[PDB]
Write the C-alpha coordinates for this entry.
Amino acid sequence: SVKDIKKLIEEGILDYEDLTENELRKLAKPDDNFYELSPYASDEKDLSLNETSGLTNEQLKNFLGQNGTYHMSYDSKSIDYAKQKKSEKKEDQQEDDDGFYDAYKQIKNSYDGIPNNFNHEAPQLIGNNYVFTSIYDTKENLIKFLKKNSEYDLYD
Amino acid sequence: SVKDIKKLIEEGILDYEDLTENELRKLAKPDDNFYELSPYASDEKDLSLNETSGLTNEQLKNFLGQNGTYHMSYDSKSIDYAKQKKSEKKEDQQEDDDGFYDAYKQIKNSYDGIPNNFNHEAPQLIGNNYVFTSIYDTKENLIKFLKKNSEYDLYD
Amino acid sequence: GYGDLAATSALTTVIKDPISLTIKDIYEHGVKNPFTKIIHKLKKFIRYRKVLRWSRMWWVLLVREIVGDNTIEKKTEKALREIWDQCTIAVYNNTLNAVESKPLLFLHGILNECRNNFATKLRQDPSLIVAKIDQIIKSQIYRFWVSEPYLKIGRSHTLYTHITPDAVPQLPKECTLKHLSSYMEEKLK
Amino acid sequence: GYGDLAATSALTTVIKDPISLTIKDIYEHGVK
Amino acid sequence: GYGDLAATSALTTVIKDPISLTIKDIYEHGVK
Protein backbone atom coordinates (compact mmCIF):
# COMPACT_ATOMS: atom_id res chain seq x y z
CA SER A 1 0.00 0.00 0.00
CA VAL A 2 3.10 2.20 0.34
CA LYS A 3 5.49 2.82 -2.58
CA ASP A 4 8.62 1.60 -0.80
CA ILE A 5 7.32 -1.57 0.82
CA LYS A 6 5.90 -3.37 -2.23
CA LYS A 7 9.24 -3.85 -3.99
CA LEU A 8 10.54 -5.61 -0.87
CA ILE A 9 7.68 -8.10 -1.21
CA GLU A 10 8.13 -8.69 -4.96
CA GLU A 11 10.99 -11.10 -4.37
CA GLY A 12 9.38 -12.84 -1.40
CA ILE A 13 5.69 -13.62 -1.80
CA LEU A 14 3.55 -11.71 -4.28
CA ASP A 15 3.96 -11.27 -8.03
CA TYR A 16 3.29 -8.26 -10.24
CA GLU A 17 -0.11 -9.32 -11.57
CA ASP A 18 -2.02 -8.87 -8.31
CA LEU A 19 -1.22 -5.20 -7.66
CA THR A 20 -3.85 -2.46 -7.55
CA GLU A 21 -4.19 0.13 -10.33
CA ASN A 22 -3.23 2.76 -7.75
CA GLU A 23 -0.29 0.56 -6.74
CA LEU A 24 1.02 0.16 -10.29
CA ARG A 25 0.61 3.91 -10.76
CA LYS A 26 2.53 4.60 -7.56
CA LEU A 27 5.35 2.18 -8.35
CA ALA A 28 5.97 3.89 -11.71
CA LYS A 29 6.04 7.40 -10.21
CA PRO A 30 9.46 8.56 -8.98
CA ASP A 31 10.63 8.06 -5.42
CA ASP A 32 11.05 10.60 -2.63
CA ASN A 33 14.62 11.31 -3.77
CA PHE A 34 12.95 13.07 -6.68
CA TYR A 35 11.95 16.62 -5.49
CA GLU A 36 14.92 16.51 -3.06
CA LEU A 37 17.44 19.15 -4.03
CA SER A 38 20.96 18.05 -4.98
CA PRO A 39 22.78 20.47 -7.33
CA TYR A 40 25.91 18.50 -8.27
CA ALA A 41 26.93 16.62 -11.41
CA SER A 42 30.30 15.23 -12.46
CA ASP A 43 32.20 13.56 -15.33
CA GLU A 44 31.21 15.93 -18.15
CA LYS A 45 32.53 13.63 -20.88
CA ASP A 46 29.29 12.75 -22.65
CA LEU A 47 28.95 10.73 -25.84
CA SER A 48 25.85 12.75 -26.76
CA LEU A 49 27.63 15.73 -28.33
CA ASN A 50 30.19 15.24 -31.08
CA GLU A 51 33.02 17.76 -31.06
CA THR A 52 33.86 16.86 -34.67
CA SER A 53 30.51 18.06 -35.98
CA GLY A 54 29.95 20.91 -38.40
CA LEU A 55 27.27 22.79 -40.26
CA THR A 56 25.42 21.68 -43.35
CA ASN A 57 27.63 22.68 -46.26
CA GLU A 58 24.66 23.27 -48.68
CA GLN A 59 27.06 22.93 -51.65
CA LEU A 60 28.28 19.46 -50.70
CA LYS A 61 24.69 18.48 -49.85
CA ASN A 62 23.73 19.75 -53.30
CA PHE A 63 26.58 17.70 -54.78
CA LEU A 64 25.90 14.53 -52.82
CA GLY A 65 22.20 14.67 -53.64
CA GLN A 66 22.70 14.44 -57.40
CA ASN A 67 24.48 11.05 -56.90
CA GLY A 68 27.43 12.35 -58.95
CA THR A 69 29.46 9.03 -59.05
CA TYR A 70 31.41 10.34 -56.04
CA HIS A 71 33.82 8.56 -53.70
CA MET A 72 33.44 10.22 -50.28
CA SER A 73 30.41 11.65 -48.46
CA TYR A 74 31.57 13.54 -45.36
CA ASP A 75 33.95 16.47 -45.10
CA SER A 76 36.82 14.74 -43.18
CA LYS A 77 38.52 17.98 -42.11
CA SER A 78 37.29 18.20 -38.53
CA ILE A 79 37.48 14.43 -38.04
CA ASP A 80 41.12 14.36 -39.11
CA TYR A 81 41.71 17.45 -36.95
CA ALA A 82 40.46 15.52 -33.92
CA LYS A 83 42.65 12.56 -34.87
CA GLN A 84 45.73 14.78 -35.08
CA LYS A 85 45.15 16.56 -31.75
CA LYS A 86 44.56 13.19 -30.08
CA SER A 87 47.99 11.96 -31.18
CA GLU A 88 49.86 15.11 -30.10
CA LYS A 89 48.56 16.58 -26.80
CA LYS A 90 47.28 13.16 -25.81
CA GLU A 91 50.42 11.08 -26.31
CA ASP A 92 52.11 13.23 -23.70
CA GLN A 93 49.15 12.53 -21.41
CA GLN A 94 49.35 8.98 -22.61
CA GLU A 95 46.47 6.91 -24.12
CA ASP A 96 43.01 6.85 -22.56
CA ASP A 97 40.32 4.45 -23.55
CA ASP A 98 36.87 5.81 -22.55
CA GLY A 99 35.21 2.72 -24.03
CA PHE A 100 36.26 0.08 -21.59
CA TYR A 101 33.33 1.17 -19.51
CA ASP A 102 32.15 4.76 -19.86
CA ALA A 103 30.82 3.96 -23.34
CA TYR A 104 28.70 0.94 -22.42
CA LYS A 105 27.25 2.63 -19.33
CA GLN A 106 26.05 5.61 -21.35
CA ILE A 107 24.69 3.41 -24.13
CA LYS A 108 22.56 1.37 -21.70
CA ASN A 109 21.26 4.61 -20.18
CA SER A 110 20.12 5.75 -23.62
CA TYR A 111 17.96 2.64 -23.91
CA ASP A 112 16.24 3.63 -20.68
CA GLY A 113 15.60 7.24 -21.71
CA ILE A 114 18.27 8.58 -19.35
CA PRO A 115 20.81 11.28 -20.27
CA ASN A 116 24.46 10.45 -19.90
CA ASN A 117 25.46 12.30 -16.73
CA PHE A 118 21.93 12.15 -15.33
CA ASN A 119 21.97 10.65 -11.84
CA HIS A 120 18.22 10.97 -11.23
CA GLU A 121 14.99 9.27 -12.20
CA ALA A 122 13.96 9.42 -15.85
CA PRO A 123 10.73 8.59 -17.68
CA GLN A 124 10.12 6.30 -20.62
CA LEU A 125 6.78 5.59 -22.27
CA ILE A 126 5.80 1.93 -21.89
CA GLY A 127 2.55 1.20 -23.65
CA ASN A 128 0.14 3.94 -22.59
CA ASN A 129 1.80 5.40 -19.48
CA TYR A 130 5.22 6.51 -18.28
CA VAL A 131 7.65 4.66 -16.02
CA PHE A 132 10.28 6.65 -14.12
CA THR A 133 13.53 4.67 -13.98
CA SER A 134 17.07 5.63 -13.07
CA ILE A 135 20.57 4.21 -13.17
CA TYR A 136 20.20 2.87 -9.64
CA ASP A 137 16.73 1.27 -9.75
CA THR A 138 16.26 0.14 -13.31
CA LYS A 139 12.70 -1.18 -12.65
CA GLU A 140 13.35 -3.89 -15.21
CA ASN A 141 10.76 -6.31 -13.83
CA LEU A 142 8.08 -3.64 -14.26
CA ILE A 143 9.09 -3.05 -17.89
CA LYS A 144 8.72 -6.79 -18.45
CA PHE A 145 5.26 -6.52 -16.89
CA LEU A 146 3.92 -3.45 -18.68
CA LYS A 147 5.16 -4.58 -22.10
CA LYS A 148 4.08 -8.23 -22.03
CA ASN A 149 0.79 -8.15 -20.14
CA SER A 150 -0.27 -4.68 -21.32
CA GLU A 151 -0.29 -5.48 -25.06
CA TYR A 152 -4.05 -5.73 -25.43
CA ASP A 153 -5.54 -4.22 -22.27
CA LEU A 154 -5.10 -0.94 -20.41
CA TYR A 155 -3.45 -0.12 -17.09
CA ASP A 156 -2.69 3.19 -15.44
CA SER B 1 10.26 58.37 11.02
CA VAL B 2 13.91 58.06 9.94
CA LYS B 3 15.02 55.66 7.17
CA ASP B 4 17.57 53.78 9.27
CA ILE B 5 15.60 53.26 12.47
CA LYS B 6 12.47 51.57 11.09
CA LYS B 7 14.22 48.42 9.89
CA LEU B 8 15.57 47.91 13.42
CA ILE B 9 11.96 47.89 14.66
CA GLU B 10 10.64 45.52 11.97
CA GLU B 11 11.96 42.48 13.81
CA GLY B 12 10.94 43.70 17.27
CA ILE B 13 7.50 45.26 17.47
CA LEU B 14 5.80 46.67 14.38
CA ASP B 15 4.95 44.99 11.08
CA TYR B 16 5.06 46.34 7.53
CA GLU B 17 1.35 47.12 7.14
CA ASP B 18 1.27 50.06 9.55
CA LEU B 19 3.93 52.25 7.90
CA THR B 20 3.22 55.68 6.43
CA GLU B 21 3.17 56.29 2.67
CA ASN B 22 6.17 58.58 3.19
CA GLU B 23 7.80 55.84 5.25
CA LEU B 24 7.32 53.15 2.58
CA ARG B 25 8.64 55.61 0.01
CA LYS B 26 11.69 56.35 2.16
CA LEU B 27 12.46 52.70 2.89
CA ALA B 28 12.53 51.89 -0.85
CA LYS B 29 14.84 54.81 -1.70
CA PRO B 30 18.57 54.03 -1.46
CA ASP B 31 20.58 54.62 1.70
CA ASP B 32 23.17 57.28 2.45
CA ASN B 33 25.92 55.04 1.04
CA PHE B 34 24.37 55.87 -2.31
CA TYR B 35 25.75 59.33 -3.42
CA GLU B 36 28.95 58.55 -1.44
CA LEU B 37 31.86 58.27 -3.83
CA SER B 38 33.76 54.98 -4.02
CA PRO B 39 35.50 54.36 -7.38
CA TYR B 40 36.68 50.75 -7.03
CA ALA B 41 35.41 47.48 -8.48
CA SER B 42 37.01 44.04 -8.58
CA ASP B 43 36.65 40.49 -9.96
CA GLU B 44 35.96 41.34 -13.61
CA LYS B 45 34.87 37.80 -14.49
CA ASP B 46 31.23 38.39 -15.34
CA LEU B 47 28.79 35.84 -16.73
CA SER B 48 26.98 38.62 -18.60
CA LEU B 49 29.25 38.75 -21.66
CA ASN B 50 30.02 35.61 -23.64
CA GLU B 51 33.49 35.52 -25.16
CA THR B 52 32.38 32.78 -27.56
CA SER B 53 29.82 35.00 -29.27
CA GLY B 54 29.87 36.09 -32.89
CA LEU B 55 27.96 38.09 -35.45
CA THR B 56 24.81 37.09 -37.26
CA ASN B 57 25.97 35.06 -40.25
CA GLU B 58 23.01 36.15 -42.49
CA GLN B 59 23.64 33.11 -44.73
CA LEU B 60 23.27 30.55 -41.95
CA LYS B 61 20.27 32.50 -40.62
CA ASN B 62 18.84 32.33 -44.13
CA PHE B 63 19.55 28.59 -44.18
CA LEU B 64 18.21 27.84 -40.72
CA GLY B 65 15.04 29.82 -41.40
CA GLN B 66 13.93 27.65 -44.31
CA ASN B 67 13.88 24.59 -41.95
CA GLY B 68 16.09 22.70 -44.42
CA THR B 69 16.05 19.26 -42.59
CA TYR B 70 19.35 20.30 -40.96
CA HIS B 71 21.26 18.74 -38.07
CA MET B 72 23.03 21.61 -36.27
CA SER B 73 22.00 25.21 -35.59
CA TYR B 74 24.99 27.15 -34.21
CA ASP B 75 28.39 27.70 -35.77
CA SER B 76 30.53 25.72 -33.25
CA LYS B 77 33.85 27.26 -34.33
CA SER B 78 34.31 29.79 -31.53
CA ILE B 79 32.82 27.46 -28.93
CA ASP B 80 35.27 24.71 -29.82
CA TYR B 81 38.03 27.33 -29.90
CA ALA B 82 37.23 28.23 -26.29
CA LYS B 83 37.18 24.54 -25.36
CA GLN B 84 40.62 24.00 -26.90
CA LYS B 85 42.25 27.02 -25.24
CA LYS B 86 40.77 25.97 -21.90
CA SER B 87 42.48 22.58 -22.13
CA GLU B 88 45.87 24.08 -23.03
CA LYS B 89 46.22 26.12 -19.85
CA LYS B 90 43.46 24.56 -17.85
CA GLU B 91 46.05 22.03 -16.84
CA ASP B 92 48.26 24.36 -14.80
CA GLN B 93 45.43 24.11 -12.26
CA GLN B 94 42.15 23.18 -13.91
CA GLU B 95 39.70 22.49 -11.03
CA ASP B 96 39.43 26.08 -9.89
CA ASP B 97 36.36 25.46 -7.68
CA ASP B 98 34.73 28.87 -8.23
CA GLY B 99 32.59 27.83 -11.19
CA PHE B 100 29.79 27.01 -8.79
CA TYR B 101 30.29 29.95 -6.43
CA ASP B 102 31.01 32.67 -8.94
CA ALA B 103 27.92 31.46 -10.76
CA TYR B 104 25.12 31.22 -8.20
CA LYS B 105 25.93 34.61 -6.67
CA GLN B 106 25.69 36.35 -10.03
CA ILE B 107 22.51 34.48 -10.96
CA LYS B 108 20.74 35.58 -7.76
CA ASN B 109 21.84 39.16 -8.41
CA SER B 110 20.21 39.02 -11.84
CA TYR B 111 16.89 38.19 -10.20
CA ASP B 112 17.20 41.37 -8.14
CA GLY B 113 18.07 43.62 -11.08
CA ILE B 114 21.70 43.93 -10.02
CA PRO B 115 24.68 43.71 -12.40
CA ASN B 116 27.31 41.11 -11.68
CA ASN B 117 30.17 43.15 -10.21
CA PHE B 118 27.83 45.84 -8.93
CA ASN B 119 28.42 46.45 -5.23
CA HIS B 120 25.84 49.22 -4.86
CA GLU B 121 22.10 49.64 -4.57
CA ALA B 122 20.00 48.71 -7.59
CA PRO B 123 16.36 49.31 -8.53
CA GLN B 124 13.67 46.86 -9.56
CA LEU B 125 10.07 47.68 -10.40
CA ILE B 126 7.67 46.08 -7.93
CA GLY B 127 4.08 46.79 -8.86
CA ASN B 128 3.89 50.51 -9.57
CA ASN B 129 7.07 51.87 -7.94
CA TYR B 130 10.77 51.05 -7.69
CA VAL B 131 12.63 49.40 -4.81
CA PHE B 132 16.38 49.95 -4.51
CA THR B 133 18.04 46.75 -3.28
CA SER B 134 21.66 45.62 -3.18
CA ILE B 135 23.70 42.52 -2.49
CA TYR B 136 24.07 43.49 1.15
CA ASP B 137 20.51 44.52 2.08
CA THR B 138 18.26 42.45 -0.13
CA LYS B 139 15.05 44.08 1.25
CA GLU B 140 13.30 40.75 0.76
CA ASN B 141 10.59 41.40 3.34
CA LEU B 142 9.60 44.57 1.48
CA ILE B 143 9.34 42.68 -1.82
CA LYS B 144 7.03 40.22 -0.07
CA PHE B 145 4.99 43.22 1.10
CA LEU B 146 4.75 45.22 -2.13
CA LYS B 147 3.92 42.17 -4.25
CA LYS B 148 1.32 40.49 -2.03
CA ASN B 149 -0.54 43.42 -0.49
CA SER B 150 -0.14 45.77 -3.46
CA GLU B 151 -1.92 43.56 -6.01
CA TYR B 152 -5.17 45.52 -6.10
CA ASP B 153 -4.44 48.85 -4.40
CA LEU B 154 -1.81 51.55 -4.83
CA TYR B 155 1.12 52.59 -2.66
CA ASP B 156 3.95 55.03 -3.29
CA GLY C 1 -2.59 62.42 -78.62
CA TYR C 2 0.41 61.34 -76.56
CA GLY C 3 -1.70 60.07 -73.66
CA ASP C 4 -2.53 56.81 -75.41
CA LEU C 5 1.15 55.83 -75.47
CA ALA C 6 1.19 56.59 -71.75
CA ALA C 7 -1.92 54.42 -71.48
CA THR C 8 -0.62 51.56 -73.64
CA SER C 9 3.07 51.27 -72.75
CA ALA C 10 2.26 51.47 -69.04
CA LEU C 11 -0.21 48.57 -69.22
CA THR C 12 2.38 46.75 -71.32
CA THR C 13 4.77 47.17 -68.38
CA VAL C 14 2.36 46.47 -65.50
CA ILE C 15 1.23 43.20 -67.11
CA LYS C 16 4.40 41.77 -68.68
CA ASP C 17 6.83 42.49 -65.85
CA PRO C 18 4.97 41.06 -62.75
CA ILE C 19 3.97 37.91 -64.61
CA SER C 20 7.54 37.43 -65.87
CA LEU C 21 8.61 37.49 -62.22
CA THR C 22 5.87 35.19 -60.91
CA ILE C 23 6.47 32.56 -63.61
CA LYS C 24 10.18 32.67 -62.73
CA ASP C 25 9.42 31.56 -59.16
CA ILE C 26 6.83 29.02 -60.32
CA TYR C 27 9.41 27.61 -62.72
CA GLU C 28 12.43 27.48 -60.43
CA HIS C 29 10.78 26.42 -57.17
CA GLY C 30 7.69 24.62 -58.48
CA VAL C 31 8.93 22.91 -61.63
CA LYS C 32 12.74 22.80 -61.76
CA ASN C 33 13.52 22.05 -58.11
CA PRO C 34 10.89 19.26 -57.92
CA PHE C 35 12.02 18.04 -61.36
CA THR C 36 15.67 17.86 -60.31
CA LYS C 37 14.47 16.04 -57.19
CA ILE C 38 12.79 13.38 -59.36
CA ILE C 39 15.74 12.45 -61.61
CA HIS C 40 18.13 12.19 -58.68
CA LYS C 41 15.58 9.90 -57.07
CA LEU C 42 15.65 7.97 -60.34
CA LYS C 43 19.46 7.84 -60.43
CA LYS C 44 19.41 5.68 -57.30
CA PHE C 45 17.21 3.25 -59.23
CA ILE C 46 18.86 3.00 -62.67
CA ARG C 47 22.23 2.46 -61.02
CA TYR C 48 22.81 1.49 -57.35
CA ARG C 49 19.77 -0.85 -57.20
CA LYS C 50 21.86 -3.81 -56.01
CA VAL C 51 23.54 -2.06 -53.08
CA LEU C 52 20.38 -0.43 -51.74
CA ARG C 53 18.94 -3.90 -51.36
CA TRP C 54 21.85 -4.63 -49.03
CA SER C 55 21.92 -1.04 -47.76
CA ARG C 56 18.31 -0.63 -46.64
CA MET C 57 18.53 -4.10 -45.14
CA TRP C 58 21.60 -3.18 -43.09
CA TRP C 59 19.86 0.05 -42.08
CA VAL C 60 16.74 -1.74 -40.81
CA LEU C 61 19.02 -3.81 -38.59
CA LEU C 62 20.95 -0.70 -37.55
CA VAL C 63 17.83 1.22 -36.48
CA ARG C 64 16.92 -1.80 -34.36
CA GLU C 65 20.40 -1.76 -32.83
CA ILE C 66 20.31 1.97 -32.08
CA VAL C 67 16.78 2.01 -30.72
CA GLY C 68 15.87 -1.49 -29.57
CA ASP C 69 12.08 -1.89 -29.08
CA ASN C 70 11.18 1.77 -28.63
CA THR C 71 9.01 3.83 -30.99
CA ILE C 72 11.17 4.97 -33.90
CA GLU C 73 10.29 8.15 -35.74
CA LYS C 74 8.95 7.42 -39.20
CA LYS C 75 9.80 10.94 -40.35
CA THR C 76 13.48 11.34 -39.40
CA GLU C 77 14.45 7.95 -40.68
CA LYS C 78 14.13 9.80 -43.98
CA ALA C 79 16.66 12.40 -42.86
CA LEU C 80 19.04 9.65 -41.78
CA ARG C 81 18.36 7.15 -44.56
CA GLU C 82 19.60 9.74 -47.06
CA ILE C 83 22.86 9.96 -45.13
CA TRP C 84 23.06 6.17 -44.97
CA ASP C 85 22.34 5.90 -48.69
CA GLN C 86 25.12 8.43 -49.35
CA CYS C 87 27.44 6.24 -47.31
CA THR C 88 26.72 3.21 -49.52
CA ILE C 89 26.88 5.24 -52.73
CA ALA C 90 30.30 6.42 -51.56
CA VAL C 91 31.54 2.92 -50.71
CA TYR C 92 30.25 1.04 -53.76
CA ASN C 93 32.09 3.46 -56.04
CA ASN C 94 35.27 2.48 -54.17
CA THR C 95 34.98 -1.31 -54.44
CA LEU C 96 35.83 -3.54 -57.35
CA ASN C 97 34.54 -6.54 -55.38
CA ALA C 98 30.87 -7.38 -55.78
CA VAL C 99 28.46 -6.88 -52.91
CA GLU C 100 27.04 -10.39 -53.13
CA SER C 101 30.51 -11.89 -53.56
CA LYS C 102 32.04 -10.39 -50.39
CA PRO C 103 29.43 -8.72 -48.18
CA LEU C 104 31.32 -7.96 -44.93
CA LEU C 105 33.82 -5.76 -46.75
CA PHE C 106 30.94 -3.38 -47.30
CA LEU C 107 29.75 -3.51 -43.67
CA HIS C 108 33.24 -2.48 -42.61
CA GLY C 109 33.16 0.12 -45.37
CA ILE C 110 29.64 1.46 -44.98
CA LEU C 111 29.42 1.55 -41.16
CA ASN C 112 32.78 3.32 -40.88
CA GLU C 113 31.67 5.74 -43.58
CA CYS C 114 28.57 6.60 -41.53
CA ARG C 115 30.51 6.35 -38.28
CA ASN C 116 32.13 9.52 -39.57
CA ASN C 117 29.32 10.89 -41.77
CA PHE C 118 27.03 10.98 -38.74
CA ALA C 119 29.87 12.45 -36.68
CA THR C 120 30.41 15.38 -39.03
CA LYS C 121 26.68 16.11 -39.33
CA LEU C 122 24.92 15.16 -36.08
CA ARG C 123 26.03 17.56 -33.35
CA GLN C 124 23.84 16.34 -30.48
CA ASP C 125 23.06 12.64 -30.33
CA PRO C 126 20.34 12.03 -27.74
CA SER C 127 19.95 8.52 -29.14
CA LEU C 128 23.77 8.18 -29.35
CA ILE C 129 23.95 7.25 -33.04
CA VAL C 130 27.67 7.89 -33.51
CA ALA C 131 28.39 6.31 -30.13
CA LYS C 132 26.58 3.06 -30.89
CA ILE C 133 28.09 2.67 -34.38
CA ASP C 134 31.45 3.09 -32.61
CA GLN C 135 30.72 0.00 -30.53
CA ILE C 136 29.29 -2.03 -33.40
CA ILE C 137 32.64 -1.57 -35.14
CA LYS C 138 34.66 -1.99 -31.93
CA SER C 139 32.92 -5.19 -30.83
CA GLN C 140 32.32 -6.69 -34.30
CA ILE C 141 28.74 -7.76 -33.61
CA TYR C 142 27.84 -6.63 -37.12
CA ARG C 143 28.77 -10.13 -38.31
CA PHE C 144 25.26 -11.20 -37.37
CA TRP C 145 23.80 -8.78 -39.92
CA VAL C 146 25.20 -11.13 -42.55
CA SER C 147 23.88 -14.59 -41.68
CA GLU C 148 21.89 -17.42 -43.24
CA PRO C 149 18.48 -15.72 -42.70
CA TYR C 150 19.98 -12.43 -43.86
CA LEU C 151 21.80 -13.62 -46.97
CA LYS C 152 18.47 -14.74 -48.43
CA ILE C 153 17.00 -11.22 -48.62
CA GLY C 154 20.06 -9.63 -50.24
CA ARG C 155 20.26 -12.27 -52.96
CA SER C 156 16.53 -12.16 -53.70
CA HIS C 157 15.05 -9.89 -56.34
CA THR C 158 13.34 -7.29 -54.20
CA LEU C 159 13.72 -3.62 -54.98
CA TYR C 160 14.93 -1.53 -52.06
CA THR C 161 11.60 0.31 -51.83
CA HIS C 162 9.89 -3.00 -51.04
CA ILE C 163 12.16 -3.69 -48.07
CA THR C 164 10.30 -2.85 -44.87
CA PRO C 165 11.16 -3.63 -41.22
CA ASP C 166 8.79 -6.61 -41.56
CA ALA C 167 10.77 -8.29 -44.35
CA VAL C 168 14.00 -8.24 -42.32
CA PRO C 169 13.87 -10.89 -39.55
CA GLN C 170 14.91 -9.83 -36.08
CA LEU C 171 18.31 -10.70 -34.67
CA PRO C 172 18.37 -12.98 -31.62
CA LYS C 173 18.61 -11.18 -28.31
CA GLU C 174 22.13 -12.47 -27.67
CA CYS C 175 23.30 -10.77 -30.88
CA THR C 176 21.90 -7.26 -30.37
CA LEU C 177 23.79 -4.34 -28.85
CA LYS C 178 21.36 -3.86 -25.96
CA HIS C 179 22.13 -7.23 -24.40
CA LEU C 180 25.80 -6.73 -25.29
CA SER C 181 25.77 -3.43 -23.41
CA SER C 182 23.85 -4.96 -20.51
CA TYR C 183 26.12 -8.03 -20.22
CA MET C 184 29.14 -5.71 -20.34
CA GLU C 185 27.94 -3.57 -17.42
CA GLU C 186 27.15 -6.74 -15.46
CA LYS C 187 30.71 -8.01 -15.96
CA LEU C 188 32.52 -4.73 -15.32
CA LYS C 189 30.51 -3.56 -12.31
CA GLY D 1 -11.07 49.01 -75.52
CA TYR D 2 -8.07 48.59 -73.22
CA GLY D 3 -8.99 45.04 -72.22
CA ASP D 4 -7.60 43.54 -75.43
CA LEU D 5 -4.10 44.77 -74.56
CA ALA D 6 -4.57 43.08 -71.19
CA ALA D 7 -5.75 40.02 -73.11
CA THR D 8 -2.90 40.06 -75.64
CA SER D 9 0.16 41.17 -73.65
CA ALA D 10 -0.67 38.71 -70.88
CA LEU D 11 -0.87 35.74 -73.26
CA THR D 12 2.33 37.07 -74.83
CA THR D 13 3.92 36.77 -71.38
CA VAL D 14 2.41 33.45 -70.23
CA ILE D 15 3.53 31.71 -73.43
CA LYS D 16 6.92 33.26 -74.21
CA ASP D 17 8.37 33.22 -70.69
CA PRO D 18 7.72 29.58 -69.51
CA ILE D 19 8.87 28.15 -72.84
CA SER D 20 12.01 30.32 -72.74
CA LEU D 21 12.77 28.72 -69.37
CA THR D 22 11.98 25.13 -70.36
CA ILE D 23 14.10 25.29 -73.53
CA LYS D 24 16.96 26.66 -71.39
CA ASP D 25 16.99 23.46 -69.32
CA ILE D 26 16.48 21.25 -72.38
CA TYR D 27 19.44 22.98 -74.02
CA GLU D 28 21.86 23.05 -71.09
CA HIS D 29 21.15 19.64 -69.57
CA GLY D 30 19.86 17.75 -72.60
CA VAL D 31 21.94 19.11 -75.46
CA LYS D 32 25.02 20.96 -74.19
CA GLY E 1 -9.52 34.51 -81.97
CA TYR E 2 -6.92 34.31 -79.21
CA GLY E 3 -5.53 30.98 -80.41
CA ASP E 4 -3.48 32.56 -83.19
CA LEU E 5 -1.42 34.50 -80.64
CA ALA E 6 -0.87 31.19 -78.87
CA ALA E 7 0.16 29.79 -82.25
CA THR E 8 2.40 32.72 -83.20
CA SER E 9 4.12 33.74 -79.95
CA ALA E 10 4.91 30.11 -79.16
CA LEU E 11 6.64 29.50 -82.51
CA THR E 12 8.39 32.83 -82.00
CA THR E 13 9.76 31.38 -78.75
CA VAL E 14 10.53 27.83 -79.94
CA ILE E 15 12.57 29.17 -82.87
CA LYS E 16 14.32 32.27 -81.52
CA ASP E 17 15.41 30.86 -78.16
CA PRO E 18 17.10 27.50 -79.14
CA ILE E 19 18.97 29.11 -82.03
CA SER E 20 20.11 31.97 -79.78
CA LEU E 21 21.62 29.31 -77.54
CA THR E 22 23.21 27.20 -80.29
CA ILE E 23 24.85 30.21 -81.96
CA LYS E 24 26.24 31.21 -78.54
CA ASP E 25 28.14 27.91 -78.31
CA ILE E 26 29.17 28.05 -81.97
CA TYR E 27 30.47 31.57 -81.40
CA GLU E 28 32.31 31.07 -78.11
CA HIS E 29 33.80 27.61 -78.70
CA GLY E 30 33.98 27.54 -82.49
CA VAL E 31 34.86 31.10 -83.42
CA LYS E 32 36.14 33.05 -80.41
Remarks:
- Helices of chain E lie at 3-31.
- The two ends of chain E are 46 Å apart (CA to CA).
- Chains E and C do not touch (no CB pair under 8 Å).
